[PDB]
Amino acid sequence: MRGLSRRVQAMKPSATVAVNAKALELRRQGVDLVALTAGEPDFDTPEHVKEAARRALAQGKTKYAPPAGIPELREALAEKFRRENGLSVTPEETIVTVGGSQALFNLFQAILDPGDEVIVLSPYWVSYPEMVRFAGGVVVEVETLPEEGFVPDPERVRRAITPRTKALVVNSPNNPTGAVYPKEVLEALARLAVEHDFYLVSDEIYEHLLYEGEHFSPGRVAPEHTLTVNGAAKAFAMTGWRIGYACGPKEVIKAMASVSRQSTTSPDTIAQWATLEALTNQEASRAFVEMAREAYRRRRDLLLEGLTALGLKAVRPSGAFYVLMDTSPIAPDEVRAAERLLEAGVAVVPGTDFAAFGHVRLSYATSEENLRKALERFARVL
Amino acid sequence: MRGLSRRVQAMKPSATVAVNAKALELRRQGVDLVALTAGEPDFDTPEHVKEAARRALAQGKTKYAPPAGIPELREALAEKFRRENGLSVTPEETIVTVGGSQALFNLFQAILDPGDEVIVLSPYWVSYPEMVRFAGGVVVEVETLPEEGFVPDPERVRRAITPRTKALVVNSPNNPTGAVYPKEVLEALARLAVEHDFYLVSDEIYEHLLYEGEHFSPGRVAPEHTLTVNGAAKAFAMTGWRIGYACGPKEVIKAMASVSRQSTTSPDTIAQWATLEALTNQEASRAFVEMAREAYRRRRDLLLEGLTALGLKAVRPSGAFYVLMDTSPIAPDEVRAAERLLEAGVAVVPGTDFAAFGHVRLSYATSEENLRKALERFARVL
Ligand SMILES: Cc1ncc(COP(=O)(O)O)c(CN[C@@H](CC(=O)O)C(=O)O)c1O
Numbered sequence: 055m056r057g058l059s060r061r062v063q064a065m066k067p068s069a070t071v072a073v074n075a076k077a078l079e080l081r082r083q084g085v086d087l088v089a090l091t092a093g094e095p096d097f098d099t100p101e102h103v104k105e106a107a108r109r110a111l112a113q114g115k116t117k118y119a120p121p122a123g124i125p126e127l128r129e130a131l132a133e134k135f136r137r138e139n140g141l142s143v144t145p146e147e148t149i150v151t152v153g154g155s156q157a158l159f160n161l162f163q164a165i166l167d168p169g170d171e172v173i174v175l176s177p178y179w180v181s182y183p184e185m186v187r188f189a190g191g192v193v194v195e196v197e198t199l200p201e202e203g204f205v206p207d208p209e210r211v212r213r214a215i216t217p218r219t220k221a222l223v224v225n226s227p228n229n230p231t232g233a234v235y236p237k238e239v240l241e242a243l244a245r246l247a248v249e250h251d252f253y254l255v256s257d258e259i260y261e262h263l264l265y266e267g268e269h270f271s272p273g274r275v276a277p278e279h280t281l282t283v284n285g286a287a288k289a290f291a292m293t294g295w296r297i298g299y300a301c302g303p304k305e306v307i308k309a310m311a312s313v314s315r316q317s318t319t320s321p322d323t324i325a326q327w328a329t330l331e332a333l334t335n336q337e338a339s340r341a342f343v344e345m346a347r348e349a350y351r352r353r354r355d356l357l358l359e360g361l362t363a364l365g366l367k368a369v370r371p372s373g374a375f376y377v378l379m380d381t382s383p384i385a386p387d388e389v390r391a392a393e394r395l396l397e398a399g400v401a402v403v404p405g406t407d408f409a410a411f412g413h414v415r416l417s418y419a420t421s422e423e424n425l426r427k428a429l430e431r432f433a434r435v436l
Numbered sequence: 437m438r439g440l441s442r443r444v445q446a447m448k449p450s451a452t453v454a455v456n457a458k459a460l461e462l463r464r465q466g467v468d469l470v471a472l473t474a475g476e477p478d479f480d481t482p483e484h485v486k487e488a489a490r491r492a493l494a495q496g497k498t499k500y501a502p503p504a505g506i507p508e509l510r511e512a513l514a515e516k517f518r519r520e521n522g523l524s525v526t527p528e529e530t531i532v533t534v535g536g537s538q539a540l541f542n543l544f545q546a547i548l549d550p551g552d553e554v555i556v557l558s559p560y561w562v563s564y565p566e567m568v569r570f571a572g573g574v575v576v577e578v579e580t581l582p583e584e585g586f587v588p589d590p591e592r593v594r595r596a597i598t599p600r601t602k603a604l605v606v607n608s609p610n611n612p613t614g615a616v617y618p619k620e621v622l623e624a625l626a627r628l629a630v631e632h633d634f635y636l637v638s639d640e641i642y643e644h645l646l647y648e649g650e651h652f653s654p655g656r657v658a659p660e661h662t663l664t665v666n667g668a669a670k671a672f673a674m675t676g677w678r679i680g681y682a683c684g685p686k687e688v689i690k691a692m693a694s695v696s697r698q699s700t701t702s703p704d705t706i707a708q709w710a711t712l713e714a715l716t717n718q719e720a721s722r723a724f725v726e727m728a729r730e731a732y733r734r735r736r737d738l739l740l741e742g743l744t745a746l747g748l749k750a751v752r753p754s755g756a757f758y759v760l761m762d763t764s765p766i767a768p769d770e771v772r773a774a775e776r777l778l779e780a781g782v783a784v785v786p787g788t789d790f791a792a793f794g795h796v797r798l799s800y801a802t803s804e805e806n807l808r809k810a811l812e813r814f815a816r817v818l
């Protein structure tokens with residue numbers, strides 16, 4: 055007979071894309087609308103990357119690549135994790151995927167069985183629960199508080215661990231909070247994975263957008279249980295290039311590669327050779343990370359001063375380019391707050407799907423002029 | 437707690453990997469061996485397509501695209517399916533995917549519920565059975581015969597249908613047979629679909645590499661039951677660009693896009709604009725296609741005369757760029773034959789995984805000088 059599978063029918067939308075869409079329906083239809091949505095840098099990919107791409111095009115590098123990625127990228131990846139993150143990884147333990155999104159999707163398919171519990175910390179990125187449910191697993195949430203700086207307490211994590219616990223997902227720097235978890239917390243969370251035998255999944259894609267504090271990889275402390283997910287998307291503004299990477303135990307990496315062969319075969323060969331340039335032309339890429347980071351700090355400090363002056367509450371971020379704002383003064387519910395803000399002229403993402411109620415997500419990957427218009431209209435809706 | 441998923445533990449090992457671990461150790465030896473194992477054109481991506489990618493870079497089209505593909509590509513796709521295939525689809529009934537591979541994966545993931553049966557025709561492309569068993573479905577293989585020219589008998593297909601049949605996959609021009617299905621046969625298969633109510637999955641990625649016959653799309657006959665898969669891979673020598681596309685009922689096409697967001701998000705943006713060039717610039721593309729098709733023709737006949745001349749049987753191909761040669765004179769089986777050929781300095785793919793037993797797959801997408809060099813070496817083992 056005909057009809058769609060249950061697994062695809064049970065899946066809910068994503069406001070993180072349903073808002074950016076809508077904004078354009080209305081903005082392509084006119085209307086001065088300031089957007090504070092968006093999960094990508096306003097910057098365009100560094101020029102040294104664009105040329106590495108053109109060189110590949112000219113060298114005729116347009117052929118099929120191995121499901122785990124070109125050998126050269128896999129070697130530059132091991133070197134990246136080793137020097138930047140201090141992870142003892144060989145090239146066999148690295149994999150190139152179609153964005154970090156696919157590094158998370160292929161992992162869940164190669165590790166989850168129906169009924170397997172996955173602990174996700176709220177607020178969390180919209181896709182985590184969806185990627186878990188699609189694979190057959192069940193989502194176990196463990197809340198982190200605004201008054202804790204949105205930093206999880208391993209005690210509370212420990213209390214969620216049942217015998218069905220297959221994986222734990224940690225993401226630092228975090229979306230949507232903007233929190234940077236300290237070495238001790240990530241280290242405590244890894245100990246728990248080693249003691250209660252489960253996988254620790256670490257999404258570190260915002261690694262280089264760090265203002266204060268330092269980035270730590272829990273993989274140092276638990277290499278046989280940790281799968282470190284990352285990608286070129288946030289760091290070098292290559293969102294549309296679809297290039298992510300992950301490292302972990304040889305058996306899980308090889309299982310993730312099998313799924314790839316089955317699905318995408320392997321990531322676009324041009325984008326791979328271009329990413330090799332971002333990882334191996336250190337002095338030109340660093341100047342890129344430095345430029346963007348100072349421009350994001352400036353954007354953050356300016357947003358925060360204006361929020362505080364308007365009487366709005368928001369926990370100060372240390373990474374990423376997101377801000378969770380308590381919509382308490384605007385409306386009795388984040389969904390209603392967004393409605394009122396949209397009328398007022400500003401697009402923003404409701405925190406309902408992030409299991410961040412009474413909150414909204416503002417992104418500062420836009421110019422300081424737009425941030426001012428938004429602080430202007432926020433003062434209008436009051 | 438830890439360990440891989442049931443679906444990954446249950447994947448069947450590859451036999452082509454056993455031979456294509458033995459080749460590379462003759463290669464690492466330094467042994468000069470030509471390879472008729474090519475699953476991709478030998479021609480590079482035409483300059484107009486390359487220019488387009490260079491322009492998209494310069495235009496700074498390096499950001500997120502819709503999960504279903506850029507609006508501009510779905511419009512052209514709608515146009516390509518109508519003008520080139522007789523399929524009356526709308527841009528809403530089209531989808532851009534990371535290769536033709538992903539169009540097929542997302543599909544089985546959007547229609548198969550555990551236990552659902554999918555009828556496959558053998559010899560079959562290695563990945564079909566694997567993608568069906570990954571969504572919990574079961575493979576029901578029906579055999580197409582050499583004595584019958586690898587064209588499916590609708591009656592033999594009608595007998596395998598049960599109340600649990602959800603899909604049927606036809607592939608014409610075929611991999612690995614090269615056969616092209618006559619309009620009459622394709623209509624009979626699309627009558628079964630409509631009659632017993634089930635999806636018909638038609639893989640047409642080898643559409644323009646046809647040397648004799650006429651390419652018919654059964655979707656033209658059973659529009660509500662057919663999902664048509666295609667790609668830029670073979671036609672425009674764009675295998676490493678990773679672009680594919682499909683068309684079918686809006687219900688399935690919408691579910692497939694749901695599976696994309698939660699996994700790959702959307703295919704590379706640069707590679708999407710290049711495809712828009714290959715598809716809209718009809719004058720330049722038509723020229724690459726006809727020039728290449730004529731190259732394949734000459735190379736095919738070059739091969740076919742030699743085998744007959746050597747007494748090696750192979751059912752003459754009318755599409756794609758593959759040949760199935762009966763390996764009885766070489767050795768007791770496909771695998772033993774292939775290893776025996778490796779020692780004579782040729783590298784071929786065993787039909788084992790294709791469920792083309794006793795046969796070996798040759799690929800004529802390589803120079804004519806290598807075709808003559810392979811031909812001489814065969815003779816040596818005969
Ligand atoms: C926390 C987190 N992890 C992974 C990704 C996926 O990145 P790639 O697939 O692009 O490499 C993201 C990405 N993106 C934005 C926009 C979106 O909805 O994808 C966001 O989360 O707002 C994030 O954060």
Ligand SMILES: Cc1ncc(COP(=O)(O)O)c(CN[C@@H](CC(=O)O)C(=O)O)c1O
Binds near residue numbers: 535
């Ligand atoms: C019949 C058939 N359908 C789909 C594909 C895959 O297409 P793309 O991902 O390239 O667009 C194939 C393709 N290709 C080769 C090599 C491979 O592993 O992708 C093959 O089948 O041997 C075929 O035949």
